[PDB]
Write a protein that binds this ligand. Structure first.
Ligand SMILES: O=C(O)CCC(=O)C(=O)O
Ligand SMILES: [Cl-]
Ligand SMILES: [Mn+2]
Length: 214
């Protein structure tokens, strides 16, 4: 089994060129300085209306191993009743939205907040390929609190018979205040997850900004 590549330096990485196109990730460690990130984490922990929700795999439901809240536009196929998106952005979240946009040149209209309570909270392998994100969505990820690992694995071609054993893999540590951008063919050609850990972890808040189209 090949060895996962590690991305942990500020930079811009074309992680693949095919089959759909160039998949690109950009890493910005310390996008938010630690002390400001400490204050932001406090605010979001006190104010975001975190709730336990269910997810779907294979038309069966389950309690997601994370708490969530939504702001702005919601992907068309999700349930507004279940996800309860707030069209009025928390002022702190609005600031971070504006700061990402001013520093990267990308716009967003949707925010998913994820609270990983501890080392047993996680998100399983997936792509951000909801239809209303379009082909090649630009997705910005901002992390606060405990470091957790963002893993990626390349979607195998058909001749691989659905085996992920030998696909290319990337590992990215996401620490306090780090911004990560995915763009290009990344949702098309890759999956990603945040795995559970077998060692004590304090809380982590992740902000995933996206653009939902009508
Ligand atoms: O928390 C992370 O960094 C990943 C979150 C994610 O993949 C999602 O919100 O769909
Ligand atoms: Cl999950
Ligand atoms: Mn995702």
């Amino acid at each position: 089994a090949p060895e996962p590549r590690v991305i942990d330096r500020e930079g811009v990485y074309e992680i693949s060129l095919s089959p759909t196109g160039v998949s690109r990730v950009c890493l910005y460690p310390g996008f938010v300085d630690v002390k400001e990130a400490d204050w932001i984490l406090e605010q979001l922990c006190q104010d975001v209306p975190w709730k336990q929700r269910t997810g779907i795999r294979e038309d069966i439901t389950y309690q997601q191993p994370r708490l969530t809240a939504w702001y702005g536009e919601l992907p068309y196929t999700y349930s507004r009743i279940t996800m309860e998106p707030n069209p009025h952005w928390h002022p702190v979240l609005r600031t971070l939205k504006n700061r990402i946009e001013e520093n990267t040149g990308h716009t967003f209209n949707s925010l998913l907040c994820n609270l990983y309570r501890n080392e047993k909270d996680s998100v399983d392998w997936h792509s951000d390929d909801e239809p209303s994100l379009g082909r090649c969505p630009i997705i910005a990820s901002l992390s606060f609190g405990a470091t957790r690992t963002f893993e990626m694995r390349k979607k195998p071609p058909p001749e691989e018979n659905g085996d992920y054993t030998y696909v290319e893999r990337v590992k990215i540590p996401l620490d306090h205040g780090t911004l990560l951008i995915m763009e290009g063919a990344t949702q098309a050609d890759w999956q990603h997850r945040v795995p559970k850990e077998y060692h004590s972890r304090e809380p982590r808040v992740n902000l995933t900004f996206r653009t939902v189209y009508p």
